[PDB]
A = this chain, B = another copy of it.
Amino acid sequence: KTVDSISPAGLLTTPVLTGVGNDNRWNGQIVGLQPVPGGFSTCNRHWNLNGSTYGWSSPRFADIDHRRGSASYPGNNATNVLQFWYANAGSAIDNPISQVAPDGFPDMSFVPFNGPGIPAAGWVGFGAIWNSNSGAPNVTTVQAYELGFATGAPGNLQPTTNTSGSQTVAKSIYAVVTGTAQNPAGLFVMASGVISTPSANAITYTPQPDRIVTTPGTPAAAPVGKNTPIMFASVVRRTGDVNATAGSANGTQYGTGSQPLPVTIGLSLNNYSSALMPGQFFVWQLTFASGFMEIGLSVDGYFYAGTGASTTLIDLTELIDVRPVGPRPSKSTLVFNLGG
């Protein structure tokens, strides 16, 4: 009957920002929005307004499991080494969405480090290596592993930007008493991750806009007018300091994803090809305790705020309620009557 479509209004409600709500990279609670000027690209769990995506990783933090790929360890002695596993891009047969990666693989560029030094930034997760042919894993290798994308493995390792021509790498950061080198081998890494750090302090918000890998054919965020794109922050645990409660003893680490997961779940099923007229964005109205803000949502899944050329984190501590408004064009500047 009549308009047999759904407006994109009820998926982003009041308790998505001051309560429950998680990111696309870690399953961390959203405490901030931080703008970036210049743009960024994310395509992992980023769903556009149609029923499609450009990437792997169905919206769920379950598991990373890969079966075929080569393993190695350096040194002539098979005692207290760093296990290094590699596969090429396009060998993931088990993933029904995209062949370029196993489901849940982090889309960051590998940093080249060697020796006993803990690497700065990155993506580490707890996991183990398992043999093929009705797999039972080896007992004497369970460790934290840093995964990512490289070129020229296992020799001169360089970070990669584009997924085409790249190869997925997985190097342990801690010592392990056994190292295998069998050609059929795989990984089993939990989906939720932490950030590896040399000492405490606070590196930067991770990722930076330039380190994020993109597949070919990805839509990029661009600042239109005085509006600029935002990125959702979450307080995540680190390896240099396990007790990273949001209090004293330096600023806690912030990890940033692209869009809220509730939005990814509620967008995946429905088609919104006519629900928002291109050239505009759908705008919500956040009301704090001492101000208010307008937040937009385009045809590509990106979120906009009219901060301009500022890189300051905006805290949803005093946020109370949101409210739908409708479509509004991109030439109109979203308001920035904040508490300051």
Q: Is the CB of B27 within 8 A of A60?
A: yes
Complex contacts, A139 vs chain B, CB 8 Å: 174-175
Whether B27 pairs with A61 at a CB distance below 8 angstroms is yes
Query: Which of the candidate stretches A157-165, A188-196, A271-279 sits at the interface with the other chain?
Result: A188-196
Are B134 and A249 interface neighbours, CB within 8 A? yes
A119 in the interface (beta carbon within 8 A): no
A63 at interface by CB-CB < 8 Å: yes
Closest beta carbon of chain B to A144's beta carbon, Å: 6
Which DSSP category, helix, strand, loop or mixed, fits chain A's interface? loop
CB atoms of B65 and A136 under 8 A apart: no
Give the chain B neighbours of A249 by CB distance below 8 A: 134
Query: Considering the chains assembled together, what is the distance between the CA atoms of A265 and B144 in angstroms?
Result: 31
Given contacts A15-B269, A269-B15, contact A136 B61 (CB under 8 A): no
A67: CB under 8 A from chain B? yes
Q: Which of A65, A126, A188, A269 is packed against the most chain B CB atoms within 10 Å?
A: A126
User: In the docked arrangement, what's the CA distance between A136 and B173, Å?
Assistant: 15
Q: Is A184 on the interface with B (CB-CB < 8 A)? A: no
| Residue interface bits A9-38, CB-to-B below 8 A is 1, else 0 | 000000100011010000111000000000
Q: With A20-B59, A28-B62, A62-B27 in contact, is A240–B136 under 8 Å at CB?
A: yes
A225 at the interface (CB under 8 A from B): no
Is A3 engaged at the interface, CB distance under 8 Å to the other chain?
Answer: no
Closest Cβ neighbor of A268 among chain B residues: B20
CB closest residue in chain B, given A137? B242
Q: Is A241 an interface residue (CB 8 A)?
A: yes
Is A186 engaged at the interface, CB distance under 8 Å to the other chain?
yes
Cα-based distance from A242 to B181 in the complex (angstroms): 19
Q: Is the CB of B265 within 8 A of A20?
A: yes
Given contacts A174-B140, A269-B19, are A242 and B130 in contact (CB under 8 A)? yes
Task: Give the contacting residue for A174; candidates B63, B142, B186, B242; CB below 8 A.
Answer: B142
Task: Given A190-B190, A192-B191, verify A65-B242 contact (CB < 8 Å).
Answer: yes
**Bound CA span A241–B28, Å:** 30
- Alpha-carbon distance between A61 and B243 when the two chains are bound, in angstroms: 18
**How far, in whole Å, are A288 and B188 apart by their CA atoms in the complex?**
35
Contact A142 B130, beta carbon cutoff 8 Å: no
Instruction: Judge if A177 is at the interface, Cβ distance under 8 Å.
Output: yes
Q: Are B144 and A188 in contact (CB under 8 A)?
A: no
* B239–A137 touching, CB < 8 Å: yes
CB contacts under 8 Å to B, within A148-205, are 174-175, 177, 186, 188, 190-192, 200
A: which residues have CB within 8 A of B? 15, 19-20, 22, 27-29, 59-63, 65, 67, 126-128, 130, 134-137, 139-140, 142-144, 174-175, 177, 186, 188, 190-192, 200, 237, 239-243, 249, 265, 269
15 A–B contacts from the bound complex (CB under 8 Å):
A15-B269, A19-B269, A20-B265, A27-B60, A27-B62, A61-B61, A62-B192, A67-B243, A134-B243, A134-B249, A135-B242, A136-B200, A137-B242, A142-B144, A190-B192
The 7 closest A-B pairs by CB, nearest first: A126-B126, A135-B242, A130-B242, A139-B174, A188-B242, A20-B265, A190-B190
